[PDB]
C-alpha cells in the first residue's frame, strides 16, 4: 500500500520521513523533530 518499505529499525523508536525518502529516528532528533516524532520527546509524552 503505502511507500513505507525501505524503512530501517536500529532502535526501539523510529519513523520514515517521506520528504527525505529515508528512515529517520525520533530519539536522535529529540527536541528538534517533526510532529510524527512528537510521541518521543514532545507534548505528546515529554
From Swiss-Prot:
Changing residue 41 to R: In CVID2 and IGAD2. Highly expressed in spleen, thymus, small intestine and peripheral blood leukocytes. Expressed in resting B-cells and activated T-cells, but not in resting T-cells. TNFR-Cys repeats lie at residues 7-41. Disulfide bonds join 8-23, 26-37, 30-41. It is found in: Membrane. Signal peptide: none annotated. Receptor for TNFSF13/APRIL and TNFSF13B/TALL1/BAFF/BLYS that binds both ligands with similar high affinity. Mediates calcineurin-dependent activation of NF-AT, as well as activation of NF-kappa-B and AP-1. Involved in the stimulation of B- and T-cell function and the regulation of humoral immunity. It is linked to Immunodeficiency, common variable, 2: A primary immunodeficiency characterized by antibody deficiency, hypogammaglobulinemia, recurrent bacterial infections and an inability to mount an antibody response to antigen. The defect results from a failure of B-cell differentiation and impaired secretion of immunoglobulins; the numbers of circulating B-cells is usually in the normal range, but can be low. Binds TRAF2, TRAF5 and TRAF6. Binds the NH2-terminal domain of CAMLG with its C-terminus. This is Tumor necrosis factor receptor superfamily member 13B. It comes from Homo sapiens. The lineage of its organism: Eukaryota, Metazoa, Chordata, Craniata, Vertebrata.
